[PDB]
Enzyme design. Structure first.
Site, PDB file in Angstrom:
ATOM      1  N   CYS A 111       2.682 -12.445  -6.242  1.00 59.27           N
ATOM      2  CA  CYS A 111       2.157 -11.104  -6.459  1.00 59.27           C
ATOM      3  C   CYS A 111       2.627 -10.107  -5.408  1.00 59.27           C
ATOM      4  CB  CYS A 111       0.630 -11.161  -6.499  1.00 59.27           C
ATOM      5  SG  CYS A 111      -0.128 -11.828  -5.000  1.00 59.27           S
ATOM      6  N   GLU A 139      -7.232  -8.060  -9.172  1.00 54.38           N
ATOM      7  CA  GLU A 139      -5.914  -7.986  -8.544  1.00 54.38           C
ATOM      8  C   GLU A 139      -4.878  -8.069  -9.659  1.00 54.38           C
ATOM      9  OE1 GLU A 139      -5.116 -10.978  -5.669  1.00 54.38           O
ATOM     10  OE2 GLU A 139      -3.112 -10.220  -5.192  1.00 54.38           O
TER      11      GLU A 139
END
Lengths: 678, 63, 63, 63
Positions: free
Chosen positions: A294, A255
Site C-alpha cells: 500500500c 485505509e
C-alpha cells in the site's frame, strides 16, 4: 482442503458457496474459503463475554508482557510462516518484511507498553487540569478500554503484518479482535491465528478469525465496537454507509488505495550521489513485494531537464529485475497473488494508457501463464496537469508512471494532486527545499521520507511502515490513522474527562496527583519496598534556611556565577529585585532533605520529569520539601538473574515559610521489589 | 556536604561496591550543576531567568 | 554541610525562633573544632597524638 | 581548612610518614563531627539541646 475459521473458541468451517484460493506462482487451487452458516452473533457474544473481561482484567504491563510472549512464540516457529507465505508469490526478501516486520511490531508495542503505560487497568494521560482557585475541584482525562470487539478487515497484501500491526494496539488497548483477512491469502492468517491460539498465552475469546465473508457480523455490532478496514475504496466506502455502523456510531477506520509520490528536486544533478539513491529507491520500492504494498511509489515527479536521465536510468536498473519463481536463484521480483489481480492490474494499465504514454513493457502481460507474473512497468505522462487519470487511478502492482515538473512549484502541486496519499518522498540535499515541500505536501501525505546521502545508509526505506509512525493518510488514502506509537491504542479506548476533588481523582487514577490526601506513617518512604508503597505515601521533610553563604558555596562549587546570584548591582536592576538562590541549589537541597542516606530499596535516581521554578528563593528564606509517592508501575523482570524492581515516581513539592510552592517537580526512581514474578 | 545528599552510592565505599554501579559515583544533580557552571555566561545579557528543565535522564554514571 | 549535622537549632530560622535559644546558633562541635584550630601548633613538636577529651560542657550558646 | 587545625599528622605528607601513624590520618574531631552528622535527626523532636560529652577516647586512627 479445508481452511477453517476460529469462532466461539472452536475451529469451525462454513458450508455453502465457497471461494477458493489459488496458488500464486503455479496456479492450482489448494485452499477453499467459506463462512456460510457460521453464527457470527455467537462469535461476538463469546468474544465480549469471555475474552473482553479477561483482557480488561489485566494491566497494561501484563498485556505488554503478553505481546512480548506472543512475539517470542511466533518468532520461534517462523519458518512455517515463510513456507505458507511462499504460496503468495513473494520471494524470501519479500516475505521477510511480511513476517519479521509484524513480529517486530509486536516487540515494539511490547516495549511501548512496558515503558510508558501504567500498572493499572486504566490509563490517565494528563497530569492535572486545575479548574478551581482554591484547589478543591480539578480534572484529568482517563482512557478506559472499550467493552466490545475490534473487527479487523485486512487486505491481501500483508496477512501476517497487516493482521499483526492491528492486533498489537487492539490487545494492548484492551479489546478482543475479530480478524477478517482477505480471502486471497487467508491461509497465512490462519497459520498466524493458530500459532497464537495453540500457545496458552492469550485468553480464550481474545482473538477470532473468519476466512470468508462476515455476512451478519456488521449488523450485530454494539456501540462499544470498532471496525478497521484495509483494501479497495469501493468496498470500504460501502462499509462506511452500513446502517448499523452509522446508527450505533461506531468508529470505522478505512485505509484505501493511494497514489504515492517520489518527488525529485531541482538541486539533484546526475553527477551527485542523490540521483543514484533516487533511482535505487524508486526501483526497490516498485519491485518489493511485486508492487503489491500500500505504500508503493506510483508517481515519480522529476524536473523537465531530468526526464531523459531518470527515464533511462530506471530502464537500465529495472531490466536487471528478473521476474520468475522465487525458489530458483537470480530472481528479484516474485509474482502477483492471483490471475484476477493480474487482470485488475492490466485493466488499470489500459485505463492509464488512454491518455499516458509508454517507456517499457506495459500492457503486454500474458494472461495465460501458469502464475501471476506481471513485468515491471514504467509509464509516462507528458501533460500531468491535463490528465486526471494519472491522479485518480492506481495500478496495484509494478506500475509507476513518470511525469515532469517545473522548478519546484509544479512539483508540489503534482504531489498534492493525488487526492490525499499514504506515503511520499522528496530526494534533495537542500533543507530549504525540504521545508517548502513539507509546508505544502504534508497536508495530503501521512508519511514523507526526505531521502539524502546521510539518511540512505541505515534507512528502513519506503515500504516498511514503522510501528511507531502514523500509517495513515487523508482523502483517497482512507482518512484513518494506524501505528502512531501509542496513538493507535487510543482508537480502542474511550477518553473520559473525569472531574472531582483531587483526593477523589487520586483514588480513581490510582496515582497521587496534586492536592490529594496524604498518608504519613512515621517511617521514611525510601525505606519501603515496592509492594508496600502506595500512591499518596507522603513525607514532610525538615527545613533548611537559605542564606547568602548557600548561594556563595553553590555558585563556587557548580561554577555558575550568574548575575542574578552573584552580583548585587545587576540583580537590583533585574526583575528579582535582589540576588536569589540558584534553582539548581533549591533542587539539590531538596534532594538533600528527602533522600534517605541508608541502604534501602531505592537503587538509582536517573530521572527528573518536569521542573518549574515559580517564585524566587532568597537569603533568609526557609525551604521545606513535601516528598510524596505518585506512580508505582513495576517492571516485568525479563530474566531470572535480574533483580525485581519498579520505576516509582515521586512528586516533589518544595515550599517556603509562606507555604507557597517554589520549585514543584517530579522525579523517577528505581525501587527494588520484594517478591519477583519471573 | 553542601546539598546534604549523603546517598550510599556516593558516600559509601562498601555499599556502592555491592550496588549496580560497582563504586561510588558522582551525583546526578552535581553533573547538572557543573554542566550549568560550564555553559551559563556570568555576564549580564538577554538571558533573564531559567525557571525550567524539560526532561532529565541520567544514562551512564559519572565516576 | 561538612559534618552533615543539619540540626534544627542550626539550620532552621523558624524552629530556632520557637526554641529555647531564640535564634539559630553555632554548633558546639564547631566551637570545639575552631578552638582546636586556634590553640594547636601546625609545626612538628613534642605533641605526638591527641586521643582524648575529658569533660565537655556547653554552657552558653554561640551566635 | 574550616576548623583551622593544620596539624602535621593531618596536613603534612613528610612528617606524618615519620610519625607513629605512618601516614596522615583523619582528624579525630572530624570523626566526632561526622558521627554527629550521622546519628542526629534533622527535624524538630523531643531532643532540645546537646551541651555535653562524657568521655572521648580515640583508639585507632581513621585514614
Amino acid at each position: 482442503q479445508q481452511l477453517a475459521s476460529f469462532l466461539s473458541g472452536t475451529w469451525q468451517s462454513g458450508r455453502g458457496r465457497s471461494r477458493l484460493i489459488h496458488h500464486a506462482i503455479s496456479g492450482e487451487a489448494l485452499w477453499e474459503v467459506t463462512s456460510e452458516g457460521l453464527d457470527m452473533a455467537a462469535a461476538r457474544q463469546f468474544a465480549i463475554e469471555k475474552g473482553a473481561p479477561a483482557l480488561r482484567a489485566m494491566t497494561f504491563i501484563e498485556r505488554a508482557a503478553m505481546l512480548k510472549a506472543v512475539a517470542k512464540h511466533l518468532l520461534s516457529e517462523k519458518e512455517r510462516f515463510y513456507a505458507l507465505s511462499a504460496q503468495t508469490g513473494a520471494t524470501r526478501a519479500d516475505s521477510w518484511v511480511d513476517i519479521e516486520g509484524g513480529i517486530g511490531t509486536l516487540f515494539t508495542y511490547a516495549s511501548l507498553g512496558s515503558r510508558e503505560l501504567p500498572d493499572d487497568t486504566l490509563w490517565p494521560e494528563d497530569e492535572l487540569i486545575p479548574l478551581s482557585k482554591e484547589g478543591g475541584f480539578a480534572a484529568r482525562h482517563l482512557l478506559t478500554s472499550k467493552s466490545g470487539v475490534a473487527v479487523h478487515i485486512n487486505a491481501f497484501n500483508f496477512p501476517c503484518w497487516g493482521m499483526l500491526e492491528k492486533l498489537a494496539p487492539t490487545w494492548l488497548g484492551g479489546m478482543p479482535a475479530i480478524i477478517k483477512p482477505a480471502t486471497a491469502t487467508a491461509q497465512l492468517t490462519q497459520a498466524m491465528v493458530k500459532s497464537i491460539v495453540d500457545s496458552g498465552l492469550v485468553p480464550e475469546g481474545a482473538i477470532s478469525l473468519i476466512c470468508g465473508s462476515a455476512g451478519d457480523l456488521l449488523d450485530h455490532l454494539d456501540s462499544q465496537d470498532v471496525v478497521t478496514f484495509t483494501g479497495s475504496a469501493a468496498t470500504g466506502q460501502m462499509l462506511r454507509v452500513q446502517p448499523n455502523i452509522v446508527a450505533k456510531s461506531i468508529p470505522f477506520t478505512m485505509e484505501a488505495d493511494s497514489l504515492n509520490c517520489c518527488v525529485l528536486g531541482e538541486d539533484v544533478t546526475p553527477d551527485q550521489p542523490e540521483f543514484a539513491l533516487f533511482i535505487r529507491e524508486v526501483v526497490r520500492e516498485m519491485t518489493t513485494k511485486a508492487g503489491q504494498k500500500c505504500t508503493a511509489i506510483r508517481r515519480i515527479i522529476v524536473p523537465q531537464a531530468l526526464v531523459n536521465a531518470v527515464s533511462d536510468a530506471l530502464v537500465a536498473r529495472l531490466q536487471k529485475v528478473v521476474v520468475g519463481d522465487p525458489a530458483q536463484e537470480g530472481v528479484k521480483m516474485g509474482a502477483l497473488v492471483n490471475a484476477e489481480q493480474r487482470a485488475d492490474v492490466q485493466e488499470k494499465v489500459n485505463i492509464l494508457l488512454a491518455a499516458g504514454c509508454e517507456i517499457r513493457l506495459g500492457g503486454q502481460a500474458d494472461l495465460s501463464a501458469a502464475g501471476a507474473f506481471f513485468p515491471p512497468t514504467l509509464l509516462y505522462c507528458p501533460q500531468p496537469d491535463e490528465t486526471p487519470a494519472v491522479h485518480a487511478t492506481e495500478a496495484f502492482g509494478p506500475v509507476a508512471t513518470l511525469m515532469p515538473a517545473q522548478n519546484q512549484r509544479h512539483a508540489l502541486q503534482l504531489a498534492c494532486a493525488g487526492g490525499g496519499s499514504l506515503a511520499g518522498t522528496l530526494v534533495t540535499a537542500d533543507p530549504q527545499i525540504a521545508r517548502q515541500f513539507i509546508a505544502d505536501a504534508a497536508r495530503t501525505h501521512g508519511r514523507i521520507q526526505i531521502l539524502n546521502e546521510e539518511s540512505a545508509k541505515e534507512s528502513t526505506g519506503h515500504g516498511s511502515p514503522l510501528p511507531q509512525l502514523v500509517h495513515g493518510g487523508p482523502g483517497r488514502a482512507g482518512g484513518g490513522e494506524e501505528l502512531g506509537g501509542l496513538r493507535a491504542v487510543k482508537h480502542y479506548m474511550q477518553r473520559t474527562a473525569v472531574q472531582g476533588s483531587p483526593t477523589m481523582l487520586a483514588a480513581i487514577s490510582k496515582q497521587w496527583v496534586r492536592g490529594a490526601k496524604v498518608e504519613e506513617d512515621r517511617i521514611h518512604p525510601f525505606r519501603k519496598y515496592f509492594e508496600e508503597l502506595q500512591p499518596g505515601d507522603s513525607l514532610l521533610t525538615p527545613r533548611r534556611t537559605m542564606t547568602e553563604a548557600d548561594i556563595v558555596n553553590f555558585a563556587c562549587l557548580s561554577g555558575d556565577h550568574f548575575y542574578a546570584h552573584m552580583d548585587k548591582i545587576a540583580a537590583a536592576e533585574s526583575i528579582f529585585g535582589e540576588r536569589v538562590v540558584h534553582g539548581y541549589f533549591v533542587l539539590s537541597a531538596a534532594a538533600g532533605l528527602f533522600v534517605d542516606a541508608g541502604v534501602g530499596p531505592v537503587i538509582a535516581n536517573y530521572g527528573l520529569e518536569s521542573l518549574r521554578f515559580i517564585e524566587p528563593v532568597k537569603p533568609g528564606d526557609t525551604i521545606q520539601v513535601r516528598l510524596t509517592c505518585k506512580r508505582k508501575t513495576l517492571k516485568k523482570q525479563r530474566s531470572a538473574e535480574e533483580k525485581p524492581t519498579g520505576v516509582v515516581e515521586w512528586a516533589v513539592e518544595v515550599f517556603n515559610q509562606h507555604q507557597t510552592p517554589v520549585a514543584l517537580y517530579s522525579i523517577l526512581t528505581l525501587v527494588a521489589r520484594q517478591h519477583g514474578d519471573f
